[PDB]
Amino acid sequence: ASMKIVVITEKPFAENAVKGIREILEKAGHEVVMIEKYKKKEDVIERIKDADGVIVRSDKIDEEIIKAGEKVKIIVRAGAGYDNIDIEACNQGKIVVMNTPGQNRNGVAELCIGMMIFGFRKGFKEGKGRELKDKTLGICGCGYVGKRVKEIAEGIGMKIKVYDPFITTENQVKKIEELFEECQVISLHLPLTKETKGKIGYELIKKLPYGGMICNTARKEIIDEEGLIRIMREREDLIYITDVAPTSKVFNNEFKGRFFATPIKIGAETEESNINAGMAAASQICDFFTNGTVKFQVNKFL
Amino acid sequence: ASMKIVVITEKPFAENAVKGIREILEKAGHEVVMIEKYKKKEDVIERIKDADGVIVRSDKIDEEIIKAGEKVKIIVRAGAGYDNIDIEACNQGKIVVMNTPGQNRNGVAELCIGMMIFGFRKGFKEGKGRELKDKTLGICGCGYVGKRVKEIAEGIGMKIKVYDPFITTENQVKKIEELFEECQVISLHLPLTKETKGKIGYELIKKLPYGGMICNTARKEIIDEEGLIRIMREREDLIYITDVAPTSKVFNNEFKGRFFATPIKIGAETEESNINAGMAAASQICDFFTNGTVKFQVNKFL
Ligand SMILES: NC(=O)c1ccc[n+]([C@@H]2O[C@H](COP(=O)([O-])OP(=O)(O)OC[C@H]3O[C@@H](n4cnc5c(N)ncnc54)[C@H](O)[C@@H]3O)[C@@H](O)[C@H]2O)c1
User: Fold this and answer.
1) If we measure between CA atoms, which residue out of B80, B7, B70 comes closest to residue B38?
2) CB B279 within 8 A of CB B93
3) Where does the D-isomer specific 2-hydroxyacid dehydrogenase catalytic domain lie (chains A, B) (predicted)?
């Protein structure tokens, strides 16, 4: 009846999201312990050994953590992506891994739109800016976020083209090359896999029309940083804006006036998105222990 | 008859807008004289002395400039507001004064939406932001810009309430007090008149809900600066974003994290808006000297 639920967040939820988490789980007679703003993963290893269930954000969950959590039955990522979790090692420990699809979608999409206007208007500094209206937007991967970005972009009056090798939808091109050729603005929403890693590089970015802008609210490592640096040095009209800051120091030093990155990923860092993702994670934990519910599971074992 | 048209723009139009102005005016057989990037309202005086028509942006057009333009028959403001022009003295000089309604509406509206997101997301810095979706937006003055903002905000999923005595629309309040009580976000789209000068002050801004935000892409003089300073010192949750930077230095010094201003007014600083505003101004001057049409005239004399 009573399960130990550990919440691992180096980047903590807003108070109201923690309260919601506690309200769902404690009413069902569970214990909730928080691990917030931890420095070393040694802190995590200790507090997890006794945990029955886990709630996580973007926190790296690797083999060493997974094995230390010997009685862990479920890990729920409050959000969409699960590249931070070692699925293979979770399969070994017979641990159910799930996410919370679409819960952060509006936070990320609103930031994506805001970044598009910000990038097209020279970072709100002096100079001749451009308007998003009557321009073509390319959505790279169209799931929950890409869908919302599209909705707002149509209200603004942008023409929409979509690339996604896994779905069938309107205005869809089959080649990712065509998207970069046809679209004045690219928004990336691809999850990080072995296939999408370093996929967006020099050969794709170069094909952009005049004043081409890439907005990245997805993952930094789907970009080939070397290729981006190379084309941005060659073409001084290109704009790159991102919620997932690049590692290289080049971008800040060389591309002022056409490059912006947030100091940290703030796409899901809103009061509302924290509540959605935090409470959805707690409810799925609740359902799993109550009814053996494994909806939204991403892995397979035994 | 070949007329001399002078274009007075301290911050110049985009080149394509200048080209579009010349295409309309030189085909009709008129002369176009550019007065770009001057420093004081004294460079204009001698060059306007033999001007027949004038195109102007936000540039200050006082009695001294009007009296010097003794053969000026028409002044067209490429844009919306005409508080920069001394109408009284124009009436005495028997000069027709026009603006170009709605031409730069999208440049401003897009910037306004971008500023709202920017402001609700801690200027794209680290912190807990808020989402515009599901919040109520108060449009203060619902003309060309106001209406276009409404349109975009509706796609974002904001609820809309309107204060504007000159129009009839749904979800409308009759007291400006009501707008500030009921709306989390306020957006100013009022012209600067006798009535609107210093209207938005302490007593109105008081009534905003928690984390109330005001976006001002209109005019700086509609704000009672000392009143705004007072309420913002009192209420640290309040946010003020503006395209029309205030006179007082207090805002930069004290309200870090909840105050954001552009270094210069950039609402109409786009390729697209320059083209629309400039070419309409040229067509309106052309029609005035061709057929004497006075549509869009904002004054009357004799
Ligand atoms: N930042 C920029 O670059 C930029 C660009 C364009 C306009 N502006 C400013 O924003 C204003 C709006 O532009 P617009 O094209 O929508 O003008 P507009 O005339 O189309 O709309 C202004 C609206 O304000 C309403 N209004 C007038 N007096 C009012 C009062 N006393 N109280 C409440 N509402 C009142 C009018 O009914 C009108 O609908 C302009 O007047 C100008 O001052 C700024």
Assistant:
1) B7
2) no
3) 21-299
Given this chain, do its domains B1-104+271-302 and B105-270 carry the same CATH topology?
yes
Experimental method: X-ray
Would you say A77 and A299 are in contact if contact means Cβ atoms under 8 Å apart?
no
CB contact under 8 A, A118 and B113: no
* DSSP string for residues in A117-139: HHHHTGGGSSS-B--STT-EEEE
The alpha carbon of B82 is separated from its chain's Cα centroid by a whole number of angstroms, namely 9
Cα distance between residue B120 and residue B130, in whole Å: 5
The answer to whether A129 contacts B269, with C-beta atoms less than 8 Å apart, is yes
* One-letter-per-residue 3-state SS of B193-238: CCCCCCCECHHHHCCCCCCCEEEECCCHHHECHHHHHHHHHHCCCC
- Shortest distance between the Cα of B57 and any Cα of chain A, in A, equals 15
Backbone angles phi, psi at A204, to 5 degrees: -85, -50
Measured CA to CA in angstroms, residue A35 lies from A19, A271, A272, B260, B278 at distances of: 15, 19, 21, 35, 59
How many angstroms separate the CA of residue B240 from the nearest CA in chain A?
15
Pick the CATH number of A1-104+271-302 from 3.40.50.510, 3.90.226.10, 2.40.50.140, 3.40.50.720: 3.40.50.720
Q: How far apart are CA B79 and CA B85, in angstroms?
A: 12
CATH code of domain B105-270: 3.40.50.720
User: Which amino acid is located at A269 in the chain?
Assistant: E
Resolution as reported, in Å: 2.2
Neighbours of B64 (CB within 10 A): 14
B163 annotated as a binding-site residue: no
Domain ranges for chain A: 1-104+271-302, 105-270
Q: Which residue positions of A form the known binding site for NAD(+)?
A: 144-145, 164, 217, 243, 265, 268
Helix (H) or strand (E) holding B90: helix B87-92
What burial class does residue A105 get, using C-beta atoms within 10 Å of its C-beta: 0-12 exposed, 13-18 middle, 19+ buried? buried
Residues 6+ apart with CB under 8 A from A190: A140, A141, A196, A199, A218, A219, A222
